[PDB]
Design a protein around this ligand. Sequence first.
Ligand SMILES: Cc1c(N)cncc1-c1cc2cc(Nc3cc4n(n3)CC(=O)N(C)CC4)ncc2c(N)c1F
Ligand SMILES: CNC(=O)c1c(C(N)=O)nc2n1[C@H]1C[C@H](C1)c1ccc(C#C[C@]3(O)CCN(C)C3=O)cc1-2
Ligand code: NA
Lengths: 290, 291
Amino acid sequence: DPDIFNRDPRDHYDLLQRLGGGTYGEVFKARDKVSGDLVALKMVKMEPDDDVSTLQKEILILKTCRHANIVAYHGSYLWLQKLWICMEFCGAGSLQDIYQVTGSLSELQISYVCREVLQGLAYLHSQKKIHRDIKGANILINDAGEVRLADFGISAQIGAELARRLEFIGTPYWMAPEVAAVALKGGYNELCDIWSLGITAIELAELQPPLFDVHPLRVLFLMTKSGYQPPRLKEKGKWSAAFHNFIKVTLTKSPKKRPSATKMLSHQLVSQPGLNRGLILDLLDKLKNG
Amino acid sequence: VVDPDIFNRDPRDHYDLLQRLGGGTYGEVFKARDKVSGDLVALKMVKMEPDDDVSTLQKEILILKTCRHANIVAYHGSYLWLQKLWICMEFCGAGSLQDIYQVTGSLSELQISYVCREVLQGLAYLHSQKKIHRDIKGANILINDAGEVRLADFGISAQIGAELARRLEFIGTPYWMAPEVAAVALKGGYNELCDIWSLGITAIELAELQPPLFDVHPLRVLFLMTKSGYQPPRLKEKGKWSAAFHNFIKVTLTKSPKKRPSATKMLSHQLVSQPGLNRGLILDLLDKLKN
Ligand SMILES: Cc1c(N)cncc1-c1cc2cc(Nc3cc4n(n3)CC(=O)N(C)CC4)ncc2c(N)c1F
Ligand SMILES: CNC(=O)c1c(C(N)=O)nc2n1[C@H]1C[C@H](C1)c1ccc(C#C[C@]3(O)CCN(C)C3=O)cc1-2
Ligand code: NA
């Protein structure tokens, strides 16, 4: 790929500190040596006997993605078999990091977050791209209180596996149509991000998604049973009917009836006036006071 | 561990390798003869390393040793020696139905009806054990010297099991995951009824010596099955086949998995329940092969 910078990222950036994990790779905070601007660098090591398809898909996803509510992609450096993905810096970290200090968010704060994530998802889905990993840990906040979607590692893995299973599909002349549809289209569509956002709205309201106490495998099994009920907000009178309805429609069980991102953006909870980053600046102020 | 019952010895202590089978189609399968008794077996060799992931093989052997049925190829055990695993199975002199019809030509309706009944019995057993074959085809249906029909090649089935095992060990935190995504993660997006469709295609293969659309690009064929107006394939020669055979093709090739009948249900279909079906039809096929 000619877009890759074939040089050492330390040519341009002072590495400052490790910021955490992600779906794969280590993320570093760094500073532009010329402008003094801050960035984050997701470093992915490519070891000798490694399939790099997932990494290549991640770069492919980001190369054509330009939307304010998606963490900006500035490019990638390949050096000493390490790929450094350079991106926009969001100084406050993830919402999950934040609410573990501040406590649960207010309804207006959640409404701003949901509106901003929905704007990002509409753009992503308009590119036939899926996030598939929406949660508080993947919603980043910068010092201005603005909302950014991050970590496409899961998205990239899904696209690489789909391309791989397709390349190694062999002769499908005996294959049933439902198997073929799964091989080409994966078994679901972008509306899974709308459900995840509804669960995130509960997360931000209650500091954990439903059934977080339950073993992950057990949770998978419960969601596939006939009696599975979409979760609800635990405290009824704490939240408006608009918030309850938002949760109800985003958590529609059938994907055939789950509304799209663009449709959800006309929902009154996220289309109401007065939603601005200042609501999140207030949250960041709670952080600043222990 | 690949299998607690592995024989930690070289199978060539006991067998002489006589010839490779499949010409690469079946992989490294070998006709082998017992050095002492002269009994013939099939040894399928798979190369192993320390770094090699053994999950698929482990699943394949688990399937073979736990799914003993009259219509599944017989499994005699596995040898591990010098980074080579050998799967020992019964030897079928005639090979697969594809081997046979490339010599004999198209099978008769009764012979195809008998194969379908026997395969459905094996599938009904497999599905009853929460197993999916997912690669039913003429090349994977063996005919032994006694004229018995036996499903084989559980490699795709093993792969599917190994993918599910890896998704669940690395499931992470699925608390934000949508129900339809959890269903695909857990159940794969389809069910054992895909095998019923594959048998319908196989019945056409045994009658015409090619599956429908064999001359169309594989990726093109895949896409067509996802288009709303996909018409399931039919038998070419209408006049050659009975109404029951056409209807059997119709029902197995129900494109909606919600309406496709199960293996046990399909066994009460008029075609595969008719009294004229007996092993002699296949022995007759073997007699034709021998001539
Ligand atoms: C079908 C198959 C798959 N798909 C994958 N892995 C193994 C087998 C598999 C093949 C067998 C083949 C034979 N015997 C014959 C006889 C002939 N062939 N093979 C082909 C050939 O080479 N000739 C020259 C024609 C006659 N016996 C037992 C087998 C067995 N137990 C298997 F599991
Ligand atoms: C103060 N700040 C951060 O703690 C930050 C930023 C930050 N920018 O500030 N990022 C992370 N963290 C931490 C660590 C972890 C959360 C993480 C994990 C994965 C990704 C990613 C990614 C991409 O797939 C590649 C490029 N791109 C636009 C993606 O989405 C970013 C981050
Ligand atoms: Na072979």
